[PDB]
């Protein structure tokens, strides 16, 4: 028989053993149909690293085990594709001479030499080595194709109309995360996805992506939109979705009411605070916000409006007109305060304050007339208002609802800036009236705009 037998394979760098000898080395003796597994006492397995850093596998038969005549002994074990082969088939490594049959990546050689050593003879036996002449090959599994999808959403979610500018495409990059120290490859594969107005979903795929790595995606920052990237597949079979969701915008509008001067400008402050109770800073369209404060100056030329474009989602707003800008107006607000989770319009209404005019007519000497005014809430007026008698602006003061004025024939006094929706009555004092018949135009009335009352004194 032959003895001192041993079988040797040097694996090429394109394959490798499995963890924990899951590789299951065994030698099977095959003879007359029947298959039998050599025991620990008949064969031993050694893995070693050669000087060139290749893995060598040896099945050493128990030295005095003699091969039974005509029996086929077969070493068997599993290998798996190494990273080298997974990269090679993905196209990421070039083959050198000697790597694969005719440099075909589908026919990588598994071995860098294999042989059997054996002795024969009693006494000083003789030793031969025969190299195996078969040089087998294999194809690694196909590399991955990794889909990527882009979804655009309007402010209020999926398939809602988008109003913001979009670029005409986005460059997406697949990042192969480095495992063995080193840096991530951020340009591993790239694709340009089309972007068309009102096409909300669009797909491409990275081709020829090597298995063995974790992947991530890079997608550009697009102004006016927030960005979410998710792997909707798995670690080993990645598939990515990028969602761009438009950010909300706050429109500040001014409305003039009962105001025939359209050439005034108004200053409107907006206070903007973050969900994390914090200083909001930055520029949103034309408006810069410094430490939560922003100021919008409105006029006819800017269509009585300003827009803070594309504020953080959830931003808290409180709009208020500057004190100076409110003089001469009853100022009311719609949507003054809120949280910005969709587009919002906040409206400042400046309603010009009403005046009262009183006129003395004489038919058929100063005349004293008492004005009584109660405010909208029906409490008597206290305060001083500008009053005009032929271009002479004198202050007129109301105490507890009453003021009193002195008119000559054909004089008008005009009292400005009175409170909106208050009620006046006028009455001549009975001493002024002595001798004359007094009647009134518009003696009582509601200050919902500029009003006129007339006192006519007829002699007799």
């Amino acid at each position: 028989g032959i003895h001192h037998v041993s079988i040797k394979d040097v694996l090429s760098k394109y394959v490798q053993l499995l963890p924990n000898g899951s590789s299951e080395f065994r030698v099977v003796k095959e003879k007359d149909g029947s298959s039998e597994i050599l025991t620990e006492n008949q064969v031993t397995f050694d893995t070693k690293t050669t000087s060139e850093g290749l893995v060598e596998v040896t099945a050493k038969f128990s030295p005095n085990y003699s091969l039974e005549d005509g029996a086929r002994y077969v070493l068997k074990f599993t290998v798996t594709s190494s990273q080298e082969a997974l990269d090679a088939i993905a196209g990421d490594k070039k083959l050198e001479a000697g790597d694969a049959e005719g440099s075909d990546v589908n026919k990588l050689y598994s071995n860098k030499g294999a042989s059997v050593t054996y002795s024969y003879g009693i006494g000083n036996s003789q030793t031969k080595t025969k190299e195996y002449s078969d040089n087998p090959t294999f194809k690694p599994s196909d590399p991955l194709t990794v889909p990527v999808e882009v979804e655009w959403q309007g402010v209020t979610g999926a398939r809602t109309v988008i109003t913001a500018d979009q670029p005409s495409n986005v460059e997406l990059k697949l990042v192969q995360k480095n495992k063995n120290g080193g840096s991530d490859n951020q340009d591993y594969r790239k694709t340009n996805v089309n972007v068309s107005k009102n096409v909300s979903n669009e797909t491409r795929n990275f081709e020829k992506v090597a298995k063995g790595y974790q992947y991530d995606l890079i997608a550009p920052d697009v102004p006016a939109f927030t960005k979410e990237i998710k792997n909707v597949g798995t670690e080993s079979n990645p598939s990515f979705k990028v969602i761009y969701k438009q950010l909300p915008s706050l429109t500040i509008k001014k409305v003039l009411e009962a105001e025939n001067n359209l050439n005034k400008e108004f200053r409107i402050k907006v206070k903007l605070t973050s969900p994390d109770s914090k200083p909001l800073n930055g520029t949103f369209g034309e408006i810069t916000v410094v430490n939560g404060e922003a100021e919008i100056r409105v006029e006819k030329r800017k269509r009585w409006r300003g827009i803070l474009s594309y504020l953080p989602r959830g931003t808290h707003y409180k709009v208020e007109e500057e004190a100076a800008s409110t003089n001469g107006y009853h100022v009311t607000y719609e949507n003054q305060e809120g949280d910005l989770n969709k587009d919002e319009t906040s409206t400042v209404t400046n309603h010009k304050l009403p005046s009262l005019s009183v006129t003395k007519k004489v038919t058929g000497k100063s005349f004293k007339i008492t004005i009584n005014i109660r405010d909208a809430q029906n409490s008597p007026l206290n305060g001083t208002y500008t009053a005009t008698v032929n271009n002479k602006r004198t202050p007129l003061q109301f105490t507890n609802g009453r003021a009193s004025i002195d008119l000559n024939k054909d004089q008008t006094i005009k009292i400005d800036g009175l409170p909106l929706d208050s009620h006046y009555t006028v009455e001549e004092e009975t001493n002024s009236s002595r001798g004359y018949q007094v009647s009134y135009e518009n003696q009582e009335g509601k200050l919902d705009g500029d009003k006129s009352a007339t006192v006519t004194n007829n002699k007799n």
Partner: peptide, 30 residues
């Protein structure tokens, strides 16, 4: 010396990605 024959093959392992069975044999004959 007896005659020896030697055969080495690799086989894809059915239904598994990237696994292959190596088979190195020896037969001795008188």
């Amino acid at each position: 010396e007896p005659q020896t024959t030697l055969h080495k093959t690799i086989t894809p392992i059915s239904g598994q990605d990237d696994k292959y069975e190596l088979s190195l044999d020896i037969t001795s004959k008188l």
